[PDB]
């Protein structure tokens, strides 16, 4: 398909001769026989194009540089077009033009560093294109390298400039009918100040022919062009993209470098210079800063110092200063992203609104939100709505949470943004295999299935919200929750499903990074739902909590007790509110004391030291609170309990059952259908589910499935001993289960959760223990040599006695053998004695038993300190754990007591038969406002707060500051001009 190239494009010969040696540099032999100053095309022949293809470096590369060779006057359309369609370069998104003759093959290191690192950064970011001279020397080889580098720790174009005839190897590069492959020997032996090698860094190559055989600046003319050209240009889709933003980078250089800056400038194509580079950059970056003829003298060397043309260059320079932009090193910066942007916004000046979206997207392809703010979203552009779609769903997809924020400020109406394909690609937008890209490949977004599947399934914001929970992005989950519907319902379920996914998450750094953000989501619910308290008692307490929201159809406090949001139960409104349910009717303030008397006087009830027909109301009011009820139930307990002991100790016989017993019977009959109605209403699998999801709860079941065994065993005639004996475990269960109703008072409520805890320090010190006593056990019962060796007696040696021995019980007469009478006990060689004890075997070797001894000593050493102490240093440490937070369980487990007694039949169990028997809109709109409002207060004070704060008081007075430092500069150049 290159057929077409020398149509279009050309090369440029000599021609005419103009003087041994010439200008154009061709030696007077080798000159065309056709033939005062040299012409650039008037001495010129035009002539089809020779040299296009693609280029091989010898070696390392790869494999493909587009390398044409066009003519000097050449109109850059072409060009470009060429390059975006044939060649399959994609418009850049930013184009950055270096510049600079840099002095020097060997650059200096801090010049390397800020290059390498900030413009090759930038074009990774925003995937721009750089173009620099095409040759292997000073900082054209160091952009190819730092390019390639780039490359290959990634996307970046390296485009190549350089004149036709310092290019070494150059008829290696000629072929009319085609050059798809070359090999260019880039590594060549000879060097000359007039060739150079091509770089091999670079994407493709251009070479402008002039036609002479070796000078510089012959490109400088067809470079600005293309560079204009390009400032022009739309980012693709004809005129449907955006322009193409541009600049010019320049690194010291010569007077003819300060002419092509002129020249640039007076195309109007935004240039930055670097300080300290040296001549020709830094004498305008000090001329920018601010004699000037002493500067002009000094920053440049002596040649054309005196000429006045220089400082007629100067001025034409200053005159257009509103695009030439300073770099500030800054003691090694290496960071002017935001010079970028400045000289970019500040070299615009129109304000059309639709040439402004470029810098929009490089901003949002950087983190510069500060300086969009600043200049793009300062008021004087016309944002509308659909400009910032695909902005802000590059800012989603980044993560550039204050990003979005400003863009979703500035009139962007999400409803009609948010749609189902762009839900998907956000979703899409998973970090590589990352969790819910697991959960999500295992389950169209399809979100419903997978929530389900966590939780246990038994508005954009509120989507947006999901997912960035999903991903666990931080900032832009806060944001979307500062502006969703349910505000608390909203931060217990965030808090549910982040500590949900952190307990999946195997991770366990990721994990950790999920609980920060639920414990931030749970404290900020927490602030929001104590103000809310505060404003109104009545409105916040009865409606915000107890409603089932959508999020899960279910009751904020469930939200909280499964999220374990303990803080939350913690805070004064849901106290009060437990409280007052856990009281019922009666006076919240009523004595303990006085309710108690009352329980056992009845009449007692209709005075004064209860505090709330009549008569039947008070009645009812009072035998009905759920405090009543518990203490009833606690009663009814113990009596149970006492009950089980008398028939368990003195009324069992084999005899069929007394009556004691069939009252026993009839009672855990009683408990069971009690059992069985709490779990058959509190969806029939899920309510089930739900139920035996409670520790106690099963415990009951435990207790009852224990008894039931026992009865039925003692019930058949020949299992009467193993009845009483799952009996008498079934006892310890029931017993166990008492401490349920510790949970009542402070003081105890958390040393059952102590308790708990410690259980699993207990099986690991058990693990350690059963090895050590193993050990320990079969060492001592191989050397005693025990004459009984029956298995059961094995192991009781092996393993009761030590443990008993932790516990200060020693039986040194058993094997001491000093303690023990010598005897002839067996017929086997050496000497025996005969312990007394009954079961330490009937008599024991004495061979090595100073080692037995010994073995004891280190035994005793070992397990009853360095062990037992292991166990409680782990014992002491779950202590403190759950001591420091003791008042945030008992309030969690106080919780879950009015829950499970708010809804029990008012009868104690031994008479609920009866009980049993018996058995078988815009007010939310204004909620939800009144909610809202209060979450908005909220979030104003505590930006009120954070603008206060020592920080950002000193952010904000450095840079008043040094707005304040610009403006007196400023004034003093006006007082200096009159
Ligand atoms: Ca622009
Ligand atoms: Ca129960």
């Not at 169209?444 to 966590?454: A, E």
């Not at 409105?539 to 409603?547: F, S």
Request: charged residues 20%; aromatic residues 10%.
């Amino acid at each position: 398909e290159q057929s077409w190239i020398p149509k279009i494009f050309k090369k440029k010969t000599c021609t005419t001769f103009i003087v041994t040696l010439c200008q154009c540099g061709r030696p007077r032999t080798a000159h065309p026989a056709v033939a005062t100053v040299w012409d650039s095309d008037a001495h010129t022949t035009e002539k089809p194009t020779d040299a296009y293809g693609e280029l091989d470096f010898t070696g390392a590369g790869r494999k493909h540089s587009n390398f044409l060779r066009l003519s000097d006057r050449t109109d850059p359309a072409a060009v470009y077009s060429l390059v975006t369609r044939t060649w399959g370069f994609r418009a850049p998104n930013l184009v950055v033009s270096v510049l600079g003759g840099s002095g020097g093959p060997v650059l200096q290191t801090w010049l390397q560093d800020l290059l390498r690192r900030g413009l090759v950064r930038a074009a990774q970011s925003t995937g721009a294109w750089i173009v620099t001279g095409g040759l292997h020397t000073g900082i054209g080889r160091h952009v190819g390298v730092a390019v390639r580098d780039h490359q290959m720790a990634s996307k970046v174009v390296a485009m190549g400039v350089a004149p036709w005839g310092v290019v070494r190897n150059r008829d290696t590069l000629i072929n009319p009918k085609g050059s798809f492959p070359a090999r260019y020997r880039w590594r060549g032996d000879p060097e000359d100040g007039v060739q150079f090698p091509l770089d091999y860094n670079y994407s493709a190559f251009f070479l402008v022919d002039d036609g002479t055989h070796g000078c510089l600046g012959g490109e400088n003319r067809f470079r600005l062009r293309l560079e204009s050209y390009i400032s022009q240009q739309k980012t693709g889709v004809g005129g449907t993209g955006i322009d193409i933003p541009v600049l010019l980078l320049l690194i010291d250089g010569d007077e003819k470098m300060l002419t092509r800056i002129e020249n640039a400038t007076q195309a109007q194509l935004p240039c930055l210079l670097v300080a300290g580079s040296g001549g020709a950059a830094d004498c305008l970056a000090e001329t920018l800063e601010d004699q000037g003829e002493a500067r002009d003298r000094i920053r440049r060397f002596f040649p054309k110092g005196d000429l006045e043309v220089l400082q007629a260059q100067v001025e034409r320079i200053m005159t257009r200063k509103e695009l030439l932009t300073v770099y500030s090193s800054e003691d090694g910066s290496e960071e002017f992203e935001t010079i970028v942007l400045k000289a970019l916004v500040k070299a615009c000046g129109s304000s059309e609104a639709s040439a402004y979206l470029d810098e929009l997207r490089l901003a949002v392809a950087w983190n510069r939100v500060d300086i969009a703010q600043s200049e793009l979203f300062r008021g004087d552009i016309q944002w509308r709505s659909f400009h910032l779609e695909a902005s802000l769903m590059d800012a989603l997809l980044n993560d550039r949470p204050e990003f979005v924020r400003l863009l979703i400020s500035h009139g962007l109406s999400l409803g009609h943004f948010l749609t189902p394909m762009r839900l998907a690609q956000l979703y899409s937008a998973a970090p590589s295999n990352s969790l819910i890209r697991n959960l999500l490949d295992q389950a169209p977004p399809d979100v419903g299935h997978v929530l389900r599947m966590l939780l246990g399934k038994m508005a954009p914001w509120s989507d947006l919200l999901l997912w960035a929970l999903l991903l666990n992005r931080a900032q832009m989950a806060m944001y979307f929750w500062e502006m969703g519907s349910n505000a608390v319902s909203s931060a217990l379920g965030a808090c549910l499903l982040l500590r949900v996914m952190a307990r999946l998450e195997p991770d366990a750094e990721e994990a950790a990074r999920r609980k920060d953000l639920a414990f931030k989501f749970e404290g900020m619910g927490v602030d929001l739902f104590g103000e809310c308290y505060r404003s109104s008692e009545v409105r916040a307490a009865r409606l915000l909590l107890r409603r089932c929201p959508l999020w899960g159809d279910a009751t904020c406090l469930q939200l909280a007790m499964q999220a374990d949001a303990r803080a939350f139960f913690a805070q004064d409104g849901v106290q009060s509110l437990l409280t007052q349910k856990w009281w019922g009717d009666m006076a919240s303030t009523t004595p303990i004391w006085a309710l108690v008397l009352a329980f056992f006087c009845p009449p007692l009830i209709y005075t004064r030291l209860i505090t709330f027909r009549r008569c039947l109301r008070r009645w009812f009011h009072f035998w009905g609170a759920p405090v009543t009820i518990f203490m009833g139930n606690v009663v009814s307990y113990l009596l149970f309990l006492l009950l089980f002991s008398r028939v368990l100790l003195v009324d069992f016989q084999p005899a069929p059952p007394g009556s004691l017993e069939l009252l026993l019977y009839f009672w855990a009959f009683t408990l069971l259908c009690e059992e069985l109605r709490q779990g058959l209403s509190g969806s029939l699998s899920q309510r089930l589910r739900l139920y035996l999801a409670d520790s106690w709860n099963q415990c009951d079941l435990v207790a009852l499935t224990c008894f039931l065994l026992g009865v039925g065993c003692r019930l058949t005639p020949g299992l009467y001993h193993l009845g009483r004996t799952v009996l008498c475990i079934d006892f310890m269960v029931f017993t166990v289960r008492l401490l349920h109703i510790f949970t009542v008072n402070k003081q105890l409520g958390p040393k059952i959760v102590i308790v708990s805890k410690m259980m699993k320090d207990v099986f690991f010190f058990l693990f350690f223990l059963g090895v050590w006593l193993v050990a320990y056990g079969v060492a001592t019962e191989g050397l005693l040599r025990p004459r009984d060796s029956d298995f059961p007696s094995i192991l009781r040696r092996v393993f009761y006695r030590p443990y008993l021995q932790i516990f200060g019980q020693i039986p040194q007469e058993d094997m001491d053998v000093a303690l023990m009478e010598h005897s002839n006990c067996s017929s086997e060689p050496g000497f025996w004695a005969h312990p007394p004890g009954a079961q330490a075997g009937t008599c024991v070797s004495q061979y090595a038993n100073w080692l037995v001894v010994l073995l004891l000593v280190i035994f005793l050493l070992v397990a009853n300190i360095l062990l037992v102490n292991l166990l409680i240093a782990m014992f002491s440490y779950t202590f403190g754990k759950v001591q420091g937070n003791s008042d945030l369980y008992w309030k969690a487990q106080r919780y879950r007591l009015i829950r499970e007694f708010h809804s029990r039949p008012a009868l104690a169990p031994p008479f609920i038969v009866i009980s049993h028997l018996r058995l078988l809109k815009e007010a939310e709109r204004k909620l939800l406002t009144w909610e809202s409002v209060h979450k908005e207060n909220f979030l104003l004070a505590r930006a009120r707060d954070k603008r206060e704060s020592d920080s950002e008081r000193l952010k904000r007075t450095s840079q008043k500051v040094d707005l304040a430092l610009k403006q007196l500069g400023h004034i003093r150049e006006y007082e200096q001009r009159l």
